[PDB]
Design an enzyme around this catalytic site. Sequence first.
Site, mmCIF file in Angstrom:
data_model
loop_
_atom_site.group_PDB
_atom_site.id
_atom_site.type_symbol
_atom_site.label_atom_id
_atom_site.label_comp_id
_atom_site.label_asym_id
_atom_site.label_seq_id
_atom_site.Cartn_x
_atom_site.Cartn_y
_atom_site.Cartn_z
ATOM 1 N N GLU A 26 -8.097 -3.022 0.854
ATOM 2 C CA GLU A 26 -8.532 -1.189 0.151
ATOM 3 C C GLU A 26 -10.225 -0.800 -0.135
ATOM 4 O O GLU A 26 -10.276 0.244 -0.303
ATOM 5 C CB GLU A 26 -7.471 -0.935 -0.934
ATOM 6 C CG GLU A 26 -6.147 -1.266 -0.626
ATOM 7 C CD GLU A 26 -4.821 -0.327 -1.077
ATOM 8 O OE1 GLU A 26 -4.338 -0.065 -1.132
ATOM 9 O OE2 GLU A 26 -4.493 -1.297 -2.542
ATOM 10 N N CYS A 55 2.898 3.436 -9.802
ATOM 11 C CA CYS A 55 4.403 2.826 -8.829
ATOM 12 C C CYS A 55 4.674 1.545 -10.222
ATOM 13 O O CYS A 55 3.970 1.627 -11.241
ATOM 14 C CB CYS A 55 3.311 2.378 -7.762
ATOM 15 S SG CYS A 55 2.764 3.179 -6.512
ATOM 16 N N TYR A 83 7.378 0.168 -1.231
ATOM 17 C CA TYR A 83 8.006 1.212 -1.967
ATOM 18 C C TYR A 83 9.819 0.797 -2.225
ATOM 19 O O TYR A 83 10.399 1.410 -0.604
ATOM 20 C CB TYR A 83 7.969 2.742 -1.689
ATOM 21 C CG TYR A 83 6.823 3.082 -1.475
ATOM 22 C CD1 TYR A 83 5.406 3.443 -0.159
ATOM 23 C CD2 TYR A 83 5.655 3.185 -2.358
ATOM 24 C CE1 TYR A 83 4.528 3.117 0.128
ATOM 25 C CE2 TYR A 83 4.657 4.312 -2.612
ATOM 26 C CZ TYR A 83 3.864 4.143 -1.732
ATOM 27 O OH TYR A 83 1.901 4.095 -1.197
ATOM 28 N N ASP A 88 14.261 8.306 -11.704
ATOM 29 C CA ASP A 88 13.756 8.869 -13.076
ATOM 30 C C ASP A 88 14.282 8.459 -13.863
ATOM 31 O O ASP A 88 15.555 7.569 -13.509
ATOM 32 C CB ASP A 88 13.982 10.723 -13.435
ATOM 33 C CG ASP A 88 13.049 11.342 -12.766
ATOM 34 O OD1 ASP A 88 11.873 11.023 -12.602
ATOM 35 O OD2 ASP A 88 13.041 12.708 -12.497
ATOM 36 N N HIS A 125 10.133 10.391 -10.193
ATOM 37 C CA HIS A 125 8.840 10.652 -10.001
ATOM 38 C C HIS A 125 8.137 9.521 -9.995
ATOM 39 O O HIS A 125 6.937 9.514 -9.882
ATOM 40 C CB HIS A 125 8.814 11.860 -11.319
ATOM 41 C CG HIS A 125 9.128 12.854 -10.693
ATOM 42 N ND1 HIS A 125 10.366 13.346 -10.979
ATOM 43 C CD2 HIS A 125 8.966 14.105 -10.425
ATOM 44 C CE1 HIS A 125 11.542 14.542 -11.346
ATOM 45 N NE2 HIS A 125 9.834 14.896 -10.546
ATOM 46 N N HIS A 142 -2.360 -5.212 -4.998
ATOM 47 C CA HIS A 142 -1.868 -4.360 -6.601
ATOM 48 C C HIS A 142 -0.394 -4.609 -7.251
ATOM 49 O O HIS A 142 -0.592 -4.604 -8.530
ATOM 50 C CB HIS A 142 -2.768 -3.399 -6.607
ATOM 51 C CG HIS A 142 -4.308 -2.999 -6.552
ATOM 52 N ND1 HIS A 142 -4.727 -2.054 -5.081
ATOM 53 C CD2 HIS A 142 -5.159 -3.657 -7.354
ATOM 54 C CE1 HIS A 142 -6.200 -2.235 -5.367
ATOM 55 N NE2 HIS A 142 -5.966 -3.225 -6.464
ATOM 56 N N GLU A 163 -4.244 3.604 -8.920
ATOM 57 C CA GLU A 163 -5.378 3.489 -8.340
ATOM 58 C C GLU A 163 -6.244 4.670 -9.111
ATOM 59 O O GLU A 163 -6.184 5.777 -9.341
ATOM 60 C CB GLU A 163 -6.033 4.610 -6.878
ATOM 61 C CG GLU A 163 -4.513 3.545 -5.761
ATOM 62 C CD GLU A 163 -3.600 4.379 -5.885
ATOM 63 O OE1 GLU A 163 -3.104 4.928 -6.306
ATOM 64 O OE2 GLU A 163 -2.500 3.004 -4.844
HETATM 65 ZN ZN LIG Z 1 -3.979 -1.076 -4.018
HETATM 66 ZN ZN LIG Z 2 -2.480 1.226 -6.310
HETATM 67 ZN ZN LIG Z 3 10.320 19.542 -10.887
HETATM 68 ZN ZN LIG Z 4 -2.576 1.321 -1.918
HETATM 69 ZN ZN LIG Z 5 10.253 17.109 -9.814
HETATM 70 ZN ZN LIG Z 6 -0.769 2.651 -1.249
#
Ligand SMILES: [Zn+2]
Ligand SMILES: [Zn+2]
Ligand SMILES: [Zn+2]
Ligand SMILES: [Zn+2]
Ligand SMILES: [Zn+2]
Ligand SMILES: [Zn+2]
EC number: 4.1.99.12
Lengths: 216, 216
Positions: A26, A55, A83, A88, A125, A142, A163
Amino acid sequence: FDAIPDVIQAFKNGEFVVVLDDPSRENEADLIIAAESVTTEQMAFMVRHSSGLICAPLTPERTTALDLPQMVTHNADPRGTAYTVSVDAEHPSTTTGISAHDRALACRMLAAPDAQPSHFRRPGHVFPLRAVAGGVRARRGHTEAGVELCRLAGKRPVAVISEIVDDGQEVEGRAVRAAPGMLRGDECVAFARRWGLKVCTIEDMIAHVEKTEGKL
Amino acid sequence: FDAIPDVIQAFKNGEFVVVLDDPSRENEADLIIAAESVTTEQMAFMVRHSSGLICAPLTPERTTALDLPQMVTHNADPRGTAYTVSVDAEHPSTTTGISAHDRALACRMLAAPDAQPSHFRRPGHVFPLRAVAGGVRARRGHTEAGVELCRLAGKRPVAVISEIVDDGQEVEGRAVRAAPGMLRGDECVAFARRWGLKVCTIEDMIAHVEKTEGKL
Ligand SMILES: [Zn+2]
Ligand SMILES: [Zn+2]
Ligand SMILES: [Zn+2]
Ligand SMILES: [Zn+2]
Ligand SMILES: [Zn+2]
Ligand SMILES: [Zn+2]
Ligand SMILES: [Zn+2]
Ligand SMILES: [Zn+2]
Ligand SMILES: [Zn+2]
Ligand SMILES: [Zn+2]
């Protein structure tokens, strides 16, 4: 760059560290911090200086224990970024889930030793990411770097990453920013120095791990 | 607040507008802009001043046409925020998907008249949101507000939204921000004025729509 042992020490102390992946990958730097005690004010800084897509790298064992299924069955990301569904915190203090306070709380809760599936609302979120079992030597990203730092520092197996962007410059009175981008190489080091943070490369992190584990 | 017709005009001109939901709901303001021609520099501004979770409200017809399944089957968000799986643009200019350039491109591509499912990689870094068929009168959220503005302004049926945060204040030399939060009410209006933007409430938007459609 700082030596990996010094990066580990800073991470163990609850500081953000700046970690660059390979220029042929990246070519980006992420802020990486242990999730266990990330504070509201730290999260505000992270949101301010990053992409804002916060994240939470964690181990496969954590994804199973906390019941965090992968977001897609047919992952079409070139890098296979893993992912899980977003979350939340299910907590009385959470409101809309997006504020620095709420996102930091979700991260701390994902890392808590007593965490259970019911502690999280899906979707939400904060974006947990499943690190591969082989660590940084297996996938030089990462996500793995965050989990590896938690292991090396003796922390809970949950990190927080995002990032570092180049937000460009303010244009007085106009809703645009001039010359935006991503921060790269030397700029990332200067960013680290500016904020009192340690900075390193995933390549050096791999070399550190190899001192004990050999080349994969 | 500005009158809805003036908000519509600004939105039609490709400007961001500032939209507040009810104080008894999120009590938050989002930046809302038409996706069709969002620029790199505009997106950089949006990332800088928002939570950085850049979402793209779109109609159910668009979710079906572009094959964007809902992220979860058992939506546990209190408001039922209808996230689809995330996307990046499948385009030669995309790199990692997160930069202002790449996120703006994904938004423009979601709105293009020739858009097809293969134009998007899943998962990715932009978060489409499915507005309910009934519009703002049915669900008083920023997702519906974005799609409603596109309809009212004669734009493609895809908007871009994100929450305006209070990033707090810089703490010289330290990786924290003091007193962060979410921008509320009067602060949101002042933000709009600062940046030359129109500002309104979803409540007034509903009243506008009711002039033609009556109360749901
Ligand atoms: Zn990365
Ligand atoms: Zn990242
Ligand atoms: Zn909202
Ligand atoms: Zn990335
Ligand atoms: Zn929201
Ligand atoms: Zn990404
Ligand atoms: Zn100014
Ligand atoms: Zn909202
Ligand atoms: Zn929003
Ligand atoms: Zn300074």
